[PDB]
């Protein structure tokens, strides 16, 4: 079956066939669309076919499909699964797997960079201290003094589900949030629960507005342990504005390395529950969402006041005006400090080119419109006008429940 | 099943059961979601009619009553004998209001019950249509104090006597392909504009020429008519600070009236059902004015603001965008012409959504269309999960008449 996708701005129509290889469900039925819904131990049986599917794709990609090497590997894995209930991926297969989970991530607008990914094999890791060392190395390599490099560190795969490796932090670098008795919040509201766990686990919180959280790491299913990231490894950018000299006095700053650490990487049926990965920020993530979401730093008013905008009525679009200035400030500061970052215009224009390229060479590009379109200036970015098809391909990155809700304490 | 919807900003959760009453397909499947796709017999009729009459009588607290039963049989006998049926005035009004209520892509449905319905089912000629339309335009405009309304022309019979308003909107600007290769006016209407010329209209070749109405009655060929200039309210666009703005020579019409859709009520199809409300600022300022394939004015405005257009990272497009939208809202409000900003409108929709969830069990909404084209996440709807599904009565898209008409 062929599915057409049209761009209402250029009239360019594309044809998708890749979706035919979609296996997982979407949450939508022929009667209801759940497109705007945030989030709608395997057995030997359902494992080998998943392993086979993957190996077929791997060998096909290297132009060795049907080869003796291809056939022996399948036999090798089958024997391994029947003999151990699981199997180990070759280094090359792991790299290939990691790159494709990224390539297949329908909610990522930065996939034009999918082939450039440094993969760190941490499958020989056995303890929390070990994980800490691996994570420090990842942070330093990826930061690269501001010239960010995409990377991912892969810890031991899940086995019986009782010895899972997990990074309890949602991101390797993030600011603490503290609920005050008066009901207000100091720091990042998004991380209040995790901050409370860190404190309960022994962390001495400086209780400031931008405290870098400590790492809470779980190795081989054991109770998590706290570690402080060497401060000198944490690159941060003070936020100032090119024209507004009072902006810097708002006391704002952010970290330069965005690294998602709470997702699950699925490759050939295997589950990698600890797989922190990082790239670089698209400006709006910080300037629109992290700073202006009502449930995040919520700085719109305070900024609007200093600009002395007419905040008496919404029709003055004072929120919209303050929003642009803030985002101008984020880009300006990062560029000035020579810390990699991309604005939403460049990022979306690149995605459209990546997407068209993918349709031609791969026959498709699963994309979540709701997530791809930036949180500000939507229609003035090309992705807004682009029809998209969302479906799930493996390898992939999946959400997984927060560990404190499932962990069996020892 | 019973689906739940969460607002990630307020944590508030709502349970949807109304979707269980959906009937038409969504275009999506368990393997693929098409949420961002602009457009994914007597035996067939009675069940549809029954479904409608049932919900109607239920709304008037007379479900299962003799009246309910009587009406059901009357319509039943009418379909069997005449292969179709006529709605009572009360059923027509209820149907139109509910089509709006069910329009998943409309952010202003909190106003759904306040709709003036003009029954034009007695219309027989194109001239009759023109008269009905002028009256609608005048009633809705109301000297700037806009009132929502819809005019319903005769329903479909054998598909060969369909009433159609060829225009996409009652009021819209023409577009012409110039020698330069460029386009004069609204690119979105180039094609329709040519069918008018190709039909007789004497295009003024301007940047903002109000198009003539191309009305089709009883399947006959469409006729042209000029909407009385004095009935077309327009607003010259100026900025409250940039005195140079007025020089861009921009203006827009005050009455947004969709006229190319099809109204479905109890199986019956009303192929000519122009309806109107009032504008939400961004529709004009963001889409009509800045869409690359529309008036595409960003650069011009940017230049006059004197900002660094050298690099995209200076966000000159975003700055210019905000100003253009401040100007649209400013002008309409200055001339006392009804208009709502995206902040106010989305806040209202969230309120409506909550009312609909507790009183009706849900509210079908298309996130992709509900979220404004600018400042997405600073509006509450961005953080509001929404379930999209089709409920009838409904407003449907339909083929442009010139691709089906047999002259
Ligand atoms: C090179 C820089 C990159 C840019 C500019 C980019 C940009 C983005 C943005 C803007 C989002 C949405 C984030 C949000 O709203 O929370 C996103 C999501 C995502 N990206 Fe990328 N990305 C980059 C690299 C990567 C890398 C290295 C990976 C994986 C190896 C990746 C995997 C994903 C995934 C899985 C999501 C969805 C996360 C979620 O559901 O919260 N991205 N990306
Ligand atoms: C009174 C104020 C109203 C407001 C502020 C409002 C606002 C909106 C907006 C912002 C859109 C999207 C327009 C676009 O992107 O092209 C829309 C679409 C729509 N509205 Fe409303 N609306 C109003 C009245 C009405 C009325 C009176 C009806 C029906 C009787 C209605 C039916 C629809 C339909 C069917 C759509 C989708 C149109 C399409 O698919 O192009 N609206 N509305
Ligand atoms: C409810 C809705 O799904 C939610 O607010 C989504 C919308 N689009 C998004 N897009 C991105 N990139 N990131 C997000 O967190 C969201 N949140
Ligand atoms: C391709 C995509 O569906 C298309 O650009 C949609 C996006 N959201 C929209 N939302 C509204 N209100 N109006 C539109 O015309 C669109 N266009
Ligand atoms: C790993 C990918 C890099 C990236 N651009 N974004 C990750 C999510 C970051 C999150 N949106 C934030 O503002 O912190
Ligand atoms: C009839 C509904 C009222 C309304 N706000 N919009 C209809 C579509 C208008 C179209 N988006 C425009 O900018 O002209
Ligand atoms: Zn869907």
From Swiss-Prot, chain A:
(6R)-L-erythro-5,6,7,8-tetrahydrobiopterin binds at residues 36, 370-371, 384. Heme b binds at residues 108, 399. L-arginine binds at residues 171, 280-281, 285. Changing residue 281 to S: 30% decrease of nitric-oxide synthase activity. Isoform N-NOS-1 is expressed in brain and colorectum. Found in the Auerbach's plexus of the enteric nervous system. Isoform PNNOS is expressed in the penis, urethra, prostate, and skeletal muscle, and coexists with the cerebellar nnos in the pelvic plexus, bladder and liver, and is detectable in the cerebellum. Changing residue 281 to H: 50% decrease of nitric-oxide synthase activity. It is found in: Cell membrane, Sarcolemma; Cell projection, Dendritic spine. Ubiquitinated; mediated by STUB1/CHIP in the presence of Hsp70 and Hsp40 (in vitro). Changing residue 281 to F: No decrease in nitric-oxide synthase activity. It comes from the Eukaryota. Homodimer. Interacts with DLG4 (via N-terminal tandem pair of PDZ domains); the interaction possibly being prevented by the association between NOS1 and CAPON. Forms a ternary complex with CAPON and RASD1. Forms a ternary complex with CAPON and SYN1. Interacts with ZDHHC23. Interacts with NOSIP; which may impair its synaptic location. Interacts with HTR4. Interacts with SLC6A4. Interacts with VAC14. The PDZ domain participates in protein-protein interaction, and is responsible for targeting nNos to synaptic membranes. Mediates interaction with VAC14. Produces nitric oxide (NO) which is a messenger molecule with diverse functions throughout the body. In the brain and peripheral nervous system, NO displays many properties of a neurotransmitter. Inhibitory transmitter for non-adrenergic and non-cholinergic nerves in the colorectum. Probably has nitrosylase activity and mediates cysteine S-nitrosylation of cytoplasmic target proteins such SRR. Inhibitory transmitter for non-adrenergic and non-cholinergic nerves in the colorectum. Belongs to the NOS family. This is Nitric oxide synthase 1.
């Amino acid at each position: 079956r062929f599915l057409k996708v049209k761009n209402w701005e250029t009239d360019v129509v594309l044809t998708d066939t890749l979706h035919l290889k979609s296996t997982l469900e979407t949450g939508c039925t022929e009667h209801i669309c759940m497109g705007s819904i945030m989030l709608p131990v395997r057995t030997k049986d359902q494992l080998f076919p998943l392993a086979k599917e993957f190996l077929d794709q791997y060998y096909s990609s290297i132009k060795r499909f049907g080869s003796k090497a291809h056939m022996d590997r399948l036999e090798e894995v089958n024997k391994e699964i029947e003999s151990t209930s699981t199997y180990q991926l070759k280094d090359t297969e792991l790299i290939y797997g990691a790159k494709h989970a990224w390539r297949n991530a329908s909610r990522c607008v930065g996939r034009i960079q999918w082939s450039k990914l440094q993969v760190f094999d941490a499958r020989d890791c056995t303890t929390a201290h070990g994980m800490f060392n691996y994570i420090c190395n990842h942070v330093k390599y990826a930061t690269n003094k501001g010239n960010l490099r995409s990377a991912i560190t892969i810890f031991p795969q899940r086995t019986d589900g009782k010895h899972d490796f997990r990074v309890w932090n949602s991101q390797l670098i993030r600011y603490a949030g503290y609920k005050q008795p008066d009901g207000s919040t100091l720091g990042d509201p998004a991380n209040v629960q995790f901050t409370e766990i860190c404190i309960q686990q022994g962390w001495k919180a400086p209780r400031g507005r931008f405290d870098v959280l400590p790492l809470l790491l779980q190795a081989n299913g054991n109770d998590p342990e706290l570690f402080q990231i060497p401060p000198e490894l944490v690159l941060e950018v003070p936020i100032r504005h090119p024209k507004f000299d009072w902006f810097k006095d708002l006391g704002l700053k952010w970290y330069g390395l965005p690294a998602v650490s709470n997702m699950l990487l699925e490759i050939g049926g295997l589950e990698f529950s600890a797989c922190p990965f990082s790239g670089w920020y698209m400006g709006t993530e910080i300037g629109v969402r992290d700073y202006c979401d009502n449930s995040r730093y919520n700085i719109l008013e305070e900024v609007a006041k200093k600009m002395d905008l007419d905040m008496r009525k919404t029709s003055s679009l004072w929120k919209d005006q303050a929003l642009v200035e803030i985002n101008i400030a984020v880009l300006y500061s990062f560029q000035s400090d020579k810390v990699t970052i991309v604005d939403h215009h460049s990022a979306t224009e690149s995605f459209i080119k990546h997407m068209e390229n993918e349709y031609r060479c791969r026959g498709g590009c699963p994309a979540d419109w709701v997530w791809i379109v930036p949180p500000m200036s939507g229609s003035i970015t090309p992705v807004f006008h682009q029809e998209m098809l969302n479906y799930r391909l493996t390898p992939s990155f999946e959400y997984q429940p927060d560990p404190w809700n499932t962990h069996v304490w020892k």
